[PDB]
Design a protein around this nucleic acid. Structure first.
Lengths: 97, 93
DNA sequence: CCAAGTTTAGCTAAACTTG
DNA sequence: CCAAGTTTAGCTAAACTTG
């Protein structure tokens, strides 16, 4: 019920995004129009898991585009201490609330 | 190519991994016994994609465990400069 | 408790990649 | 070409989480 976009936010999310029209329609109805995921499961004959994933794809896409300014995602295999530091960097940024 | 394992690496690989006996059989058949994926596609009535995925789940598992002692894969969203630092570190291998 | 939503190994399609 | 293998959005099952 919580977790939502504007049309403008939504349009950003789906720009470039490689997904079909069903996914788009489901995500808009849920994220923009505040309708329950369950009415799309029912109406489309789909499990609730499928609908949660559809909504998730558009959600995730929006987040990947709204990372704090200047910030980058990074992944790497690191030795223990260097890995610990990344954990601490993040965790100290989470305990910045 | 062509990626392969002993039955002992294979076991190390899948330890702690949630994986069914079918994925196990396909992965063993291909990575240990050296058989081709197409074999299992027919014998089990699966698509090539499914077999290709089965082999992948185990291979990725092995990869994560043949990593050097203490080494860990990590992911984060950081300020560029800290990301720069992580890339610099990660290059050092 | 309840009902809605989440998660993840594992499947398909079908376009793509490799040798 | 073709044979075999890769990729990834989309789906399920059904345990688990959330409100």
């Amino acid at each position: 019920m919580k977790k939502r976009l504007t049309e403008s936010q939504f349009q950003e999310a789906i720009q470039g995004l490689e997904v079909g029209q069903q996914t788009i329609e489901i995500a808009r109805g849920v994220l923009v129009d505040g309708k329950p995921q369950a009415t799309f499961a029912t109406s489309l004959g789909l499990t609730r898991g499928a609908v949660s994933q559809a909504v998730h794809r558009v959600w995730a896409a929006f987040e990947d585009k709204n990372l704090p300014e200047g910030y980058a995602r990074v992944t790497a295999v690191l030795p223990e201490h260097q890995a610990y530091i990344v954990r601490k960097w993040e965790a100290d940024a989470k305990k910045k609330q």
